[PDB]
Structures are given as C-alpha cells and as structure tokens.
Curated annotation (Swiss-Prot), chain A:
Transmembrane segments: none
UniProt PTM: Phosphorylated. Tyrosine phosphorylation is indirectly stimulated by IGFBP6.
Portion of the full sequence shown: 151 to 225 of 299
Induction: Expression increases approximately 3-fold upon entry into G1 phase compared to other phases of the cell cycle. Also induced following inhibition of mitochondrial protein synthesis by thiamphenicol.
Tissue expression notes: Expressed in myoblasts.
Region (Necessary for transcriptional repression): 1-24
Localization per Swiss-Prot or TrEMBL: Mitochondrion inner membrane; Cytoplasm; Nucleus; Cell membrane
Family: Belongs to the prohibitin family.
Positions in coiled-coil regions: 40-75
Modification N6-acetyllysine occurs at: 50
The encoding gene: PHB2
UniProt free text on domains: LC3-interaction region (LIR) is required for interaction with MAP1LC3B/LC3-II and for Parkin-mediated mitophagy.
Modified residues (Phosphoserine): 1
Span of the signal peptide: none
Protein name (database record): Prohibitin-2
UniProtKB/Swiss-Prot annotation, chain B:
Subunit note: The mitochondrial prohibitin complex consists of two subunits (PHB1 and PHB2), assembled into a membrane-associated ring-shaped supercomplex of approximately 1 mDa. Interacts with STOML2. Interacts with MAP1LC3B (membrane-bound form LC3-II); the interaction requires PHB2 and takes place upon Parkin-mediated mitochondrial damage. Interacts with STAT3 (unphosphorylated or phosphorylated at 'Ser-727'). Interacts with CLPB. Interacts with CD86 (via cytoplasmic domain); the interactions increases after priming with CD40.
Residues of the full protein shown: 69 to 136 of 272
UniProt similarity note: Belongs to the prohibitin family.
Induction and repression of expression: Expression increases approximately 3-fold upon entry into G1 phase compared with other phases of the cell cycle. Also induced following inhibition of mitochondrial protein synthesis by thiamphenicol.
Organism of derivation: Homo sapiens (Human)
Lineage: Eukaryota, Metazoa, Chordata, Craniata, Vertebrata
Tissue: Widely expressed in different tissues.
Function summary: Protein with pleiotropic attributes mediated in a cell-compartment- and tissue-specific manner, which include the plasma membrane-associated cell signaling functions, mitochondrial chaperone, and transcriptional co-regulator of transcription factors in the nucleus. Plays a role in adipose tissue and glucose homeostasis in a sex-specific manner. Contributes to pulmonary vascular remodeling by accelerating proliferation of pulmonary arterial smooth muscle cells. In the mitochondria, together with PHB2, forms large ring complexes (prohibitin complexes) in the inner mitochondrial membrane (IMM) and functions as a chaperone protein that stabilizes mitochondrial respiratory enzymes and maintains mitochondrial integrity in the IMM, which is required for mitochondrial morphogenesis, neuronal survival, and normal lifespan. The prohibitin complex, with DNAJC19, regulates cardiolipin remodeling and the protein turnover of OMA1 in a cardiolipin-binding manner. Regulates mitochondrial respiration activity playing a role in cellular aging.
Highest taxon, organism lineage: Eukaryota
Localization, UniProt: Mitochondrion inner membrane; Nucleus; Cytoplasm; Cell membrane
Protein name: Prohibitin 1
Length: 75, 68
C-alpha cells in the first residue's frame, strides 16, 4: 500500500540508490521514474468486497424498513 | 584495460536449504603493468577464466552461511 501511495518518495529513494549503484558503471543518469506497481489479485478485490459489505448492510437496513412496513401491513 | 561488468548467477543453498537464486554483478578490469604476464599465461581473454569461478565459489561461501 505504501509502494502505491508513498510511491513518489519510493521513486526518489530507488533513484538515489540506483544512482549510487550505477555510478561505478561509467554512465550518467538524469531523469528516471517508477511507473509500474501492481499487486497480484486480492487487495483491490477485498477492498471492493468490504465496500459491498457496507452497502449490503445498508441494503439489509432497508430490508429492515420494509420489515416495518410488512409489520404494520400484516397487522 | 577499461572496465566491464559481469553478472554471475548462483543457485545457492541457504541455511534452511532454500534454493535461492542470486545474481551478482562484478565490475572489473585488468591491471596495466602485468598485461604481459597476463597474456603469457592466459592470453588476450583474461577476464572470463576468472570471474565465474571466484564469484560462484564465493556467493556459495556467503549465502551458505545465510538463510533464505
């Protein structure tokens, strides 16, 4: 999650450290960015499942409202 | 007599004996003065005879002492 959000600074740190690694190799680095950061399947899917769980609690809350209306309807 | 990087991979057994693949880059170059001897014994192609042996034996020496 930090690699995704804090990624600008991830770029900065990886850039410093590769600059110091590649200086010994006789080449000059000027501008470099970290561009791909993906994680396998599950973080986004579970986040959306959590959102669906919240909205399903709300959906059942209005199932509960129709429970009131069926309450008095069937009275 | 300039510099060259050479990458040696080692499938080293760690302490828990997990086969860990470690690729080591060794930057290297020859020595100016003893290029005569270097050719009498080895020849023009001094570099390739050396880097893999030392690097493999030594990455094994190291990561053998270390865990996955």
């Amino acid at each position: 999650s930090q690699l995704i959000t804090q990624r600008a600074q991830v770029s900065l740190l990886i850039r410093r450290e590769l600059t110091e690694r590649a200086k010994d190799f006789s080449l000059i680095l000027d501008d470099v960015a970290i561009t791909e950061l993906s994680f396998s399947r599950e973080y986004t899917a579970a986040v959306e499942a959590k959102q669906v769980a919240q909205q399903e609690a709300q959906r059942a809350q209005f199932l509960v409202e129709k429970a009131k209306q069926e309450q008095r309807q069937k009275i | 007599c300039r510099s060259r990087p050479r990458n040696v991979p080692v499938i080293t057994g760690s302490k828990d004996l997990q086969n860990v693949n470690i690729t080591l880059r060794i930057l290297f170059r020859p020595v100016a003065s003893q290029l005569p001897r270097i050719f009498t014994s080895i020849g023009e192609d001094y570099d390739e005879r050396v880097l893999p042996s030392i690097t493999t034996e030594i990455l094994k020496s190291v990561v053998a002492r270390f865990d996955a």
